[PDB]
Amino acid sequence: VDALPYFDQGVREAAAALVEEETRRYTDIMRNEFERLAARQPIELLSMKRYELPAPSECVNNSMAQLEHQAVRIENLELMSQHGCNAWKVYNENLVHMIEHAQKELQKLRKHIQDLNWQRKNMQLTAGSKLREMESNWVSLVSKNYEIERTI
Amino acid sequence: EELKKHEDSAIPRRLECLKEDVQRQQEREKELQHRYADLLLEK
Amino acid sequence: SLQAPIMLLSGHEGEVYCCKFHPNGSTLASAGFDRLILLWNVYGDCDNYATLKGHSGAVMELHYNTDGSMLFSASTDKTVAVWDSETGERVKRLKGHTSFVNSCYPARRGPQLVCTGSDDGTVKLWDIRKKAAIQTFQNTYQVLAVTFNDTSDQIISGGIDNDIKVWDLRQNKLTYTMRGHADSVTGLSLSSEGSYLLSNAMDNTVRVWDVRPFAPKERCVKIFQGNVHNFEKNLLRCSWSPDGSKIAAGSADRFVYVWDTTSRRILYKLPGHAGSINEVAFHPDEPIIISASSDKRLYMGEI
Amino acid sequence: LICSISNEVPEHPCVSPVSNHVYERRLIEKYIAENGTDPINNQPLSEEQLIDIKVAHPIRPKPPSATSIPAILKALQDEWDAVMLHSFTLRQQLQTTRQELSHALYQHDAACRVIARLTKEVTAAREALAT
Amino acid sequence: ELSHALYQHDAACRVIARLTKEVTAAREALATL
């Protein structure tokens, strides 16, 4: 389990082959039905392709539709312009308050994680020394036990 | 957070193993001297 | 750190030649030029309670037993007085030198033994039960510092010939000589393991020597620097930390040097001492340093 | 500023008092009726427990070139295209994460066996030098 | 779970790289002795 990242400063292609060799060894209603069918089939349901084309010389109705629609557009255009005319930028003001809040979080997350990493790093250097102390003492016995036997 | 916890685990146990590994090495050092020390007794 | 930031231990009327920590480390006893030895409880408020008189010289060397129950110190009048830590009574006095006793050590573990060295050039082995010298080793030059190995087989002596000498108790012969100092050796001390002996000298260098059945044969294991001796010619003594990681030695420049045991790096170099420093000692459990000096004051540095 | 369910910019945001997180009212109201608990923290939460919040209101500039015609035909078509091809592509992403999970855990356990095999190897090679 | 595993996997992978080179050092040492 234990593998020191910060301390171990000192093969990937080699170790990959040895790991490779051990792997050689080893809730909605009807809505959901038509939505999943539309995505699976890759086909969007056709809308009213009628209003744009039409033809001069049933059309008494189609004409009276157009007049009302045009009136609504003027009414909507005035309403839309009226909203756009003063609001045109109101949304932008709100969108800038919404954006800056996300990047404040980005910093708060950035600061915690950095601290954690630093902690880990510091922690390592502690033990890597202790392991260095152990190995030096290990090599001392190794030759000490020999030089004791050589003389006997 | 969890990575830090993992590192913590990693530390406690690595050293204690090497610590006990060092204790045994000291014993072989501690005895091998005595046989050398007993060379002077026979003289 | 245990209740110690720095404090201040006073009471002495003369230079404090030696001070050692209680084997327990709870309590302490110091002595010096004042022909008085002071015991101040280390913990609580650091106040002395028992004083041990009975010395017509400078309590030059002061020591403790492994248990620390019996404390023996060496005076300048050629007589060593043995005093138990509890009740403070001169319990076993041994008089065999013709001149000043410069230093003494008590063998730990093995049956009670005491070694002394003096200006008469001799080193003497005492059995506390005999009231007489057991062995005498005539050198020829004045002997300044002496210590036993942990096996109680060897006596290590530093004199004014710049050469540390090792004596065999069975052969009674000069077993070893150590070369490496350019001037008189003033203070020797063994590691708690038996492994290494620490020396101060008038050659300007602190040297560690390793004593082992199998030795490299040129045992200048390490050298440290910073420790200054001058015209005062004070005996200078050095000590090992409880775990052997730190080395402290006093100087005549009022600086408490403490190097790293493994990297030989000056860990500390504390001030607060007016006069030359004669001995530095380590608490046996906590990182507390007792510094004793010729300014008649003690400090309890905490690390 | 956003809702913590759909990824919207809410028109009537409401905050829950067990876990401080802003949801759009319709979407949080639907969750409580499905299963009466907070979606994020899985804590007990009801419709009366919610607290409506107020803000300076959100404004969208309806395009200048707009009408009933593009809004019925072109805009609404693109919205159900963008919903369809995203969730299908998102279902494709979830399927690969589970496959790439299996390649991760197998290669991990493969490495564990190498370490266990080499832990017996190394110390016995060091022991043989001691002997 | 994917992230914590992949990190800890390549972390545990470095245990082997270290272990293998020490095991190797024990062989030539004992062999030559």
XYZ file of C-alpha atoms in Angstrom:
662
model
C 0.000 0.000 0.000
C 2.669 2.533 1.072
C 4.471 4.425 -1.712
C 5.938 7.842 -0.870
C 5.361 10.367 -3.699
C 7.050 13.501 -2.326
C 10.059 11.674 -0.859
C 10.772 9.254 -3.728
C 12.682 11.539 -6.106
C 14.464 8.634 -7.873
C 11.477 2.130 -15.650
C 7.820 2.970 -16.365
C 8.063 0.905 -19.573
C 9.760 -1.896 -17.613
C 7.249 -1.922 -14.736
C 4.355 -1.670 -17.230
C 5.494 -4.972 -18.782
C 5.616 -6.711 -15.363
C 2.111 -5.368 -14.548
C 1.028 -6.489 -18.049
C 2.337 -10.034 -17.428
C 0.281 -10.265 -14.204
C -2.754 -9.191 -16.272
C -1.952 -11.885 -18.879
C -2.229 -14.297 -15.922
C -5.542 -12.959 -14.527
C -38.372 7.297 -13.341
C -40.623 9.475 -15.530
C -43.931 9.101 -17.417
C -44.523 8.927 -21.217
C -41.987 11.793 -21.554
C -39.056 9.371 -21.089
C -40.238 6.892 -23.763
C -40.386 9.393 -26.651
C -37.271 11.273 -25.458
C -35.119 8.112 -25.341
C -36.566 7.028 -28.713
C -35.761 10.433 -30.270
C -32.155 10.276 -29.014
C -31.635 6.605 -29.973
C -33.066 7.027 -33.491
C -31.224 10.366 -33.922
C -34.301 12.157 -35.311
C -35.949 15.377 -34.094
C -39.748 15.672 -34.400
C -40.788 17.924 -37.307
C -42.242 21.368 -36.521
C -44.680 23.599 -38.456
C -42.920 24.298 -41.774
C -45.868 26.316 -43.119
C -45.870 29.976 -42.015
C -42.726 30.984 -43.942
C -43.556 29.829 -47.490
C -47.338 30.129 -48.227
C -48.706 31.261 -51.633
C -50.850 34.075 -53.185
C -54.111 33.248 -55.026
C -58.544 28.468 -46.789
C -56.143 31.346 -47.566
C -58.653 33.846 -46.099
C -57.896 32.156 -42.768
C -54.133 31.954 -43.516
C -54.172 35.680 -44.334
C -56.038 36.605 -41.119
C -53.474 34.520 -39.182
C -50.650 36.590 -40.637
C -52.246 39.915 -39.789
C -52.734 38.930 -36.147
C -49.247 37.467 -35.936
C -47.752 40.644 -37.400
C -49.717 42.728 -34.919
C -48.424 40.563 -32.066
C -44.874 40.921 -33.364
C -45.230 44.701 -33.397
C -46.768 44.445 -29.938
C -44.127 41.904 -28.984
C -41.412 43.870 -30.765
C -42.447 46.981 -28.860
C -42.655 44.862 -25.718
C -39.477 43.081 -26.686
C -37.734 46.343 -27.601
C -39.210 47.911 -24.497
C -37.794 45.113 -22.460
C -34.612 44.822 -24.520
C -34.243 48.589 -24.747
C -33.792 49.044 -21.029
C -33.098 45.432 -20.016
C -30.626 45.030 -22.893
C -27.634 44.791 -20.544
C -29.559 44.009 -17.351
C -28.926 40.302 -17.990
C -25.244 41.066 -18.561
C -25.042 42.800 -15.177
C -26.511 39.679 -13.516
C -24.311 37.290 -15.528
C -21.154 39.022 -14.223
C -22.283 38.569 -10.586
C -22.958 34.893 -11.382
C -19.533 34.357 -12.991
C -17.290 35.904 -10.316
C -18.880 33.681 -7.639
C -17.662 30.514 -9.426
C -14.034 31.712 -9.640
C -14.044 32.566 -5.906
C -14.866 28.901 -5.300
C -12.044 27.946 -7.699
C -9.672 29.821 -5.361
C -11.121 28.363 -2.117
C -10.656 24.858 -3.546
C -7.190 25.803 -4.870
C -6.050 26.927 -1.394
C -7.202 23.847 0.532
C -5.653 21.339 -1.888
C -2.327 23.181 -2.023
C -2.129 23.096 1.768
C -2.856 19.365 1.750
C -0.116 18.731 -0.825
C 2.381 20.776 1.186
C 1.511 18.792 4.305
C 2.070 15.483 2.496
C 5.403 16.697 1.121
C 6.620 17.770 4.563
C 5.467 14.464 6.048
C 7.518 12.444 3.535
C 10.938 14.098 4.025
C 10.494 13.023 7.667
C 10.361 9.294 6.978
C 12.728 9.239 3.972
C 15.392 10.378 6.431
C 14.376 7.679 8.936
C 14.612 5.069 6.146
C 18.051 6.479 5.279
C 19.022 6.090 8.955
C 17.812 2.475 8.929
C 19.729 1.523 5.761
C 23.001 2.993 7.057
C 22.617 0.933 10.247
C 21.670 -2.080 8.113
C 24.914 -1.883 6.098
C 26.944 -1.431 9.292
C 25.731 -4.716 10.798
C 26.118 -6.483 7.449
C 29.870 -5.795 7.458
C 30.208 -5.835 11.271
C 28.883 -9.403 11.515
C 31.453 -10.424 8.869
C 34.460 -8.739 10.511
C 33.501 -10.430 13.805
C 33.551 -13.896 12.118
C 36.713 -13.255 10.058
C 38.735 -12.707 13.252
C 37.261 -15.587 15.288
C -8.412 14.901 1.464
C -8.445 11.115 1.048
C -5.045 11.253 -0.674
C -3.659 13.011 2.402
C -5.167 10.292 4.597
C -3.504 7.667 2.376
C -0.144 9.423 2.769
C -0.644 9.460 6.539
C -1.205 5.681 6.464
C 1.878 5.316 4.236
C 4.050 7.090 6.838
C 2.953 5.290 9.993
C 4.252 1.727 9.459
C 7.167 2.290 7.061
C 9.360 3.685 9.845
C 8.274 1.293 12.605
C 9.241 -1.634 10.351
C 12.694 -0.158 9.657
C 12.960 0.738 13.374
C 12.509 -2.912 14.377
C 14.696 -3.908 11.393
C 17.403 -1.653 12.875
C 17.001 -3.095 16.401
C 17.852 -6.620 15.173
C 20.890 -5.356 13.229
C 22.177 -3.725 16.425
C 22.073 -7.094 18.236
C 24.414 -8.795 15.741
C 26.725 -5.785 16.123
C 26.362 -6.009 19.922
C 27.479 -9.663 20.109
C 30.160 -9.830 17.386
C 32.235 -7.403 19.468
C 32.185 -9.704 22.510
C 33.852 -12.588 20.651
C 36.578 -10.137 19.569
C 36.785 -8.880 23.177
C 37.299 -12.488 24.333
C 40.374 -12.803 22.055
C 42.261 -10.682 24.620
C 41.215 -12.973 27.515
C 42.933 -16.024 26.004
C 46.132 -13.965 25.539
C 9.706 21.101 26.196
C 9.057 20.463 29.883
C 8.412 23.497 32.150
C 11.764 24.878 31.027
C 12.284 28.033 28.923
C 15.571 29.155 30.483
C 15.321 30.001 34.228
C 18.481 30.750 36.259
C 20.292 28.678 38.882
C 22.399 30.640 41.377
C 23.899 30.272 44.847
C 27.532 29.518 44.027
C 30.379 31.746 45.248
C 32.953 30.507 42.744
C 33.278 28.894 39.339
C 30.990 25.868 38.861
C 33.430 23.244 37.610
C 30.895 20.444 37.219
C 27.199 19.650 37.233
C 25.373 16.468 36.317
C 21.746 15.514 35.869
C 19.976 13.162 38.251
C 19.839 9.673 36.852
C 16.107 10.165 37.220
C 16.519 13.668 35.765
C 13.986 15.068 38.222
C 16.725 16.511 40.410
C 20.224 17.897 40.070
C 23.501 18.340 41.935
C 26.342 20.717 41.035
C 29.706 21.656 42.528
C 32.775 23.734 41.726
C 35.511 26.071 43.032
C 33.318 27.031 45.994
C 33.958 23.662 47.650
C 30.216 23.264 47.798
C 27.938 20.983 45.795
C 24.452 22.196 45.061
C 21.280 20.227 44.647
C 18.308 22.103 43.251
C 15.142 20.273 42.329
C 14.877 20.636 38.589
C 11.067 20.459 38.455
C 8.521 22.773 40.077
C 10.581 25.852 40.902
C 14.182 24.595 40.695
C 15.293 25.119 44.311
C 18.196 23.444 46.139
C 17.521 21.603 49.407
C 20.550 19.523 50.366
C 24.121 20.779 50.390
C 27.087 18.446 50.738
C 30.064 19.929 52.570
C 33.274 18.134 53.467
C 35.783 19.183 50.850
C 39.089 20.984 51.336
C 39.556 21.528 47.617
C 37.761 22.239 44.371
C 35.023 19.694 43.739
C 36.631 19.323 40.317
C 34.817 16.195 39.044
C 31.190 15.406 40.030
C 29.505 12.147 38.863
C 26.431 9.935 39.326
C 25.725 6.197 39.341
C 23.496 4.461 36.798
C 20.890 4.391 39.525
C 22.247 7.735 40.721
C 21.658 6.741 44.340
C 25.318 7.225 45.127
C 27.081 10.337 43.939
C 30.864 10.620 44.002
C 32.857 13.785 43.152
C 36.588 14.493 42.928
C 38.291 17.357 44.800
C 41.597 19.246 44.374
C 43.077 18.164 47.738
C 43.784 14.564 46.598
C 40.817 13.006 48.480
C 37.504 11.818 46.951
C 34.298 11.952 49.044
C 31.385 9.595 48.304
C 27.924 10.914 49.108
C 24.563 9.262 48.651
C 21.915 11.357 46.899
C 19.523 10.778 49.795
C 20.507 12.231 53.217
C 23.693 13.814 51.859
C 26.320 12.230 54.123
C 30.007 11.684 53.408
C 29.758 7.919 53.202
C 32.992 6.459 51.778
C 36.122 8.629 51.398
C 39.189 7.219 49.598
C 42.582 8.872 49.988
C 45.470 7.701 47.841
C 46.928 10.481 45.710
C 49.955 12.611 46.588
C 48.621 15.585 44.599
C 45.412 17.193 43.346
C 42.705 14.845 42.131
C 41.770 16.176 38.711
C 38.894 13.730 37.882
C 36.853 10.624 38.766
C 34.419 8.176 37.182
C 32.150 5.471 38.593
C 31.676 2.154 36.758
C 28.030 1.449 35.901
C 26.563 -2.100 35.836
C 29.507 -4.131 37.244
C 30.466 -4.349 40.940
C 31.175 -0.886 42.339
C 34.380 0.690 41.000
C 35.817 4.182 40.924
C 38.666 5.630 38.934
C 40.748 8.699 39.708
C 43.562 10.675 38.103
C 45.837 13.373 39.497
C 48.804 15.657 39.074
C 51.117 12.940 40.466
C 50.848 11.253 37.052
C 48.949 8.218 38.341
C 45.607 6.640 37.707
C 44.023 4.602 40.492
C 41.260 2.016 40.662
C 39.223 1.987 43.789
C 36.861 -0.531 45.216
C 34.523 1.420 47.513
C 34.620 -1.490 50.046
C 38.425 -1.682 50.541
C 39.649 1.746 51.774
C 42.747 1.192 49.627
C 43.894 1.453 46.016
C 43.431 -1.682 43.906
C 45.658 -0.745 40.992
C 47.999 2.128 40.250
C 49.102 3.167 36.748
C 52.096 5.456 36.715
C 52.092 7.598 33.574
C 54.776 10.360 33.960
C 52.753 13.462 33.043
C 49.760 14.951 34.862
C 46.459 13.184 34.190
C 43.378 15.364 33.577
C 40.410 13.165 32.611
C 39.397 9.530 33.082
C 36.469 7.269 32.128
C 35.571 3.518 32.128
C 34.151 1.553 29.173
C 30.710 -0.068 29.759
C 32.263 -3.509 30.160
C 34.337 -2.253 33.129
C 37.471 -3.736 31.455
C 39.183 -0.611 30.233
C 40.256 2.735 31.623
C 40.526 5.674 29.291
C 42.860 8.477 30.343
C 43.549 11.927 28.902
C 46.616 13.828 30.049
C 48.910 16.611 28.908
C 50.847 14.513 26.422
C 48.106 15.039 23.808
C 47.509 11.309 23.702
C 44.512 9.404 25.053
C 45.611 6.171 26.720
C 43.718 2.934 27.251
C 44.552 0.595 30.154
C 43.715 -3.139 30.431
C 42.554 -4.145 33.935
C 43.805 -7.742 33.558
C 47.129 -7.158 31.791
C 47.834 -3.817 33.496
C 49.408 -2.650 30.270
C 49.173 0.276 27.920
C 46.753 -1.330 25.445
C 46.067 1.620 23.143
C 47.288 5.084 22.367
C 45.258 7.650 20.451
C 47.010 10.347 18.450
C 45.145 13.351 17.013
C 45.325 16.171 19.545
C 47.934 18.913 19.302
C 47.552 19.860 22.972
C 46.358 18.760 26.432
C 43.122 16.828 26.781
C 40.827 18.291 29.377
C 37.656 16.201 29.255
C 36.532 12.716 28.234
C 33.106 11.137 28.132
C 31.682 7.828 26.899
C 28.467 7.400 24.902
C 25.628 5.653 26.790
C 26.174 2.703 24.388
C 29.874 2.309 25.109
C 30.411 2.990 21.447
C 32.115 6.426 21.349
C 34.275 8.686 23.518
C 34.140 12.458 23.279
C 37.217 14.637 23.943
C 38.011 18.351 24.487
C 41.530 19.709 24.168
C 43.783 22.755 24.087
C 44.433 22.003 20.395
C 41.192 23.798 19.460
C 39.262 20.668 18.427
C 36.456 18.430 19.767
C 37.164 14.862 18.623
C 35.022 11.729 18.768
C 36.898 8.440 19.100
C 35.285 5.023 18.595
C 36.289 2.183 20.920
C 35.332 -1.321 19.735
C 36.668 -4.888 19.714
C 37.131 -4.401 15.946
C 38.487 -0.898 15.350
C 39.444 0.867 12.089
C 42.787 1.358 13.880
C 42.777 5.112 13.103
C 39.826 6.119 15.238
C 39.505 9.808 14.352
C 35.791 9.219 13.695
C 34.795 12.893 13.607
C 36.071 16.398 14.385
C 34.030 19.458 15.434
C 34.981 23.109 15.815
C 33.985 26.338 17.578
C 35.111 25.522 21.117
C 37.748 28.018 22.371
C 40.343 27.605 25.175
C 42.496 30.541 26.367
C 44.914 31.760 29.093
C 42.542 30.690 31.899
C 43.498 27.008 31.268
C 40.204 25.815 32.772
C 39.425 22.125 32.604
C 36.765 21.762 29.926
C 34.258 18.913 29.958
C 31.821 17.651 27.370
C 28.680 15.478 27.506
C 26.552 13.141 25.361
C 22.821 13.575 25.057
C 20.616 10.778 26.525
C 20.108 9.336 23.005
C 23.627 10.099 21.650
C 22.275 12.529 18.997
C 23.769 15.711 20.525
C 27.194 16.747 21.734
C 27.673 19.575 24.152
C 30.934 21.095 25.244
C 31.688 24.242 27.188
C 34.133 26.932 26.077
C 36.036 29.928 27.366
C 34.138 32.242 25.024
C 30.920 31.785 27.032
C 29.152 29.856 24.277
C 27.263 26.611 24.806
C 28.001 24.640 21.643
C 25.859 21.618 20.776
C 26.553 19.777 17.509
C 24.422 17.209 15.678
C 25.525 13.679 16.528
C 25.209 12.390 12.959
C 25.932 15.418 10.754
C 28.376 17.255 13.045
C 26.399 20.494 12.697
C 26.127 23.163 15.397
C 22.551 22.720 16.575
C 22.765 25.348 19.307
C 25.197 28.036 20.452
C 23.308 29.746 23.268
C 24.517 32.842 25.198
C 23.574 34.165 28.634
C 26.863 33.230 30.249
C 29.215 35.970 31.420
C 32.256 33.940 32.342
C 33.995 30.972 30.792
C 31.803 27.879 30.745
C 33.049 24.817 32.513
C 30.409 22.117 31.946
C 27.252 21.448 29.993
C 24.817 18.642 30.905
C 21.696 17.078 29.387
C 18.532 16.043 31.184
C 18.049 12.241 30.802
C 14.417 12.402 29.495
C 13.585 15.916 28.273
C 15.510 18.367 26.049
C 16.904 20.434 28.960
C 20.459 21.735 29.138
C 22.225 22.756 32.329
C 25.078 25.131 31.672
C 27.611 25.765 34.456
C 30.232 28.496 34.366
C 32.758 30.619 36.136
C 30.199 33.394 36.520
C 28.654 31.392 39.351
C 25.268 31.008 37.711
C 23.397 28.149 36.045
C 20.883 28.184 33.209
C 18.227 25.606 32.275
C 17.947 25.919 28.500
C 14.956 24.092 26.994
C 14.978 22.869 23.378
C -26.692 31.870 -9.069
C -27.437 28.420 -10.547
C -29.757 25.565 -9.543
C -28.236 22.426 -7.995
C -30.316 19.905 -9.958
C -30.788 20.820 -13.637
C -27.925 23.297 -14.117
C -30.333 26.212 -14.638
C -30.245 29.895 -13.742
C -33.386 29.861 -11.545
C -36.437 32.128 -11.934
C -37.733 31.432 -8.414
C -34.814 30.096 -6.344
C -35.604 28.495 -2.954
C -33.094 27.373 -0.285
C -33.398 24.312 1.972
C -32.597 24.754 5.678
C -30.914 21.353 6.261
C -28.281 21.837 3.530
C -27.565 25.374 2.319
C -28.036 24.917 -1.420
C -30.205 26.905 -3.848
C -32.611 24.979 -6.103
C -35.237 26.129 -8.609
C -38.646 25.711 -6.931
C -40.252 23.395 -9.525
C -37.332 20.939 -9.479
C -37.015 20.782 -5.658
C -40.804 20.506 -5.301
C -40.722 17.485 -7.636
C -37.962 15.737 -5.640
C -39.821 16.080 -2.305
C -42.951 14.450 -3.777
C -40.896 11.636 -5.369
C -39.028 10.930 -2.110
C -39.285 13.370 0.815
C -35.581 14.099 1.380
C -32.879 16.582 0.345
C -31.283 15.453 -2.970
C -27.655 16.313 -2.073
C -27.304 15.414 1.634
C -30.105 12.776 1.777
C -31.540 14.452 4.904
C -35.218 14.725 5.865
C -36.815 17.651 4.019
C -40.402 18.716 3.236
C -42.086 21.384 1.072
C -42.835 23.593 4.112
C -39.166 23.315 5.214
C -38.034 25.242 2.098
C -37.390 29.010 2.187
C -37.966 31.152 -0.937
C -35.189 33.654 -1.727
C -35.323 37.033 -3.494
C -32.890 38.602 -5.969
C -32.887 41.463 -8.535
C -34.486 39.107 -11.146
C -32.859 37.608 -14.239
C -33.116 39.179 -17.705
C -32.721 37.473 -21.092
C -32.570 39.594 -24.240
C -34.989 37.947 -26.671
C -33.254 38.103 -30.022
C -34.127 41.126 -32.170
C -34.854 38.791 -35.091
C -37.534 36.819 -33.223
C -41.115 35.869 -33.935
C -43.657 33.102 -33.343
C -42.150 31.407 -36.443
C -38.489 30.793 -35.426
C -39.535 30.242 -31.787
C -41.952 27.493 -32.916
C -39.767 26.038 -35.688
C -36.016 26.739 -35.455
C -35.415 27.506 -31.746
C -37.621 24.747 -30.280
C -36.149 22.204 -32.735
C -32.587 23.028 -31.657
C -33.553 22.679 -27.974
C -34.824 19.095 -28.345
C -31.870 18.254 -30.595
C -29.452 19.600 -27.955
C -31.259 17.659 -25.184
C -31.311 14.432 -27.236
C -27.733 14.308 -28.584
C -26.209 15.392 -25.240
C -27.832 12.786 -22.950
C -27.137 10.053 -25.528
C -23.500 11.196 -25.616
C -23.583 11.427 -21.793
C -24.874 7.834 -21.605
C -21.907 6.920 -23.842
C -19.550 8.625 -21.353
C -20.995 6.743 -18.345
C -20.600 3.383 -20.139
C -16.867 3.939 -20.811
C -16.172 5.114 -17.231
C -17.385 1.724 -15.943
C -15.278 -0.143 -18.540
C -12.228 2.006 -17.756
C -12.997 1.354 -14.063
C -12.577 -2.403 -14.641
C -9.231 -1.885 -16.426
C -8.106 0.262 -13.471
C -8.981 -2.170 -10.657
C -7.598 -5.212 -12.536
C -4.289 -3.454 -13.297
C -4.220 -2.321 -9.640
C -4.705 -5.843 -8.257
C -2.139 -7.048 -10.830
C 0.360 -4.617 -9.265
C -0.542 -5.772 -5.714
C 0.469 -9.336 -6.628
C 3.800 -8.095 -8.054
C 4.566 -6.227 -4.812
C 3.573 -9.201 -2.637
C 5.721 -11.449 -4.872
C 8.669 -9.022 -4.706
C 8.284 -8.477 -0.919
C 9.118 -12.176 -0.392
C 11.914 -11.910 -2.975
C 13.810 -8.851 -1.702
C 13.981 -9.499 2.067
C 15.079 -13.118 1.493
C 17.807 -11.880 -0.885
C 18.898 -9.413 1.837
C 18.636 -12.196 4.430
C 20.920 -14.403 2.297
C 23.586 -11.657 2.375
C 23.246 -11.616 6.174
C 23.707 -15.407 6.242
C -13.337 6.297 -6.804
C -11.655 6.326 -10.245
C -9.376 9.236 -9.316
C -8.457 7.942 -5.836
C -7.682 4.523 -7.353
C -5.547 5.680 -10.309
C -3.524 7.959 -7.999
C -3.133 5.229 -5.349
C -2.396 2.650 -8.084
C 0.576 4.527 -9.561
C 1.517 5.369 -5.953
C 1.463 1.670 -5.037
C 3.298 1.056 -8.351
C 6.280 3.082 -7.077
C 6.441 0.720 -4.073
C 7.399 -2.044 -6.533
C 10.048 0.016 -8.362
C 11.727 0.676 -5.003
C 11.222 -2.903 -3.786
C 12.613 -4.471 -6.987
C 15.904 -2.540 -6.907
C 16.540 -3.405 -3.230
C 15.740 -7.078 -3.818
C 18.205 -6.902 -6.733
C 20.912 -5.338 -4.523
C 20.527 -8.206 -2.020
C 21.323 -10.751 -4.762
C 24.695 -9.505 -6.089
C 25.756 -8.632 -2.533
C 25.120 -12.157 -1.208
C 26.265 -13.757 -4.486
C 29.632 -11.966 -4.512
C 30.087 -12.662 -0.777
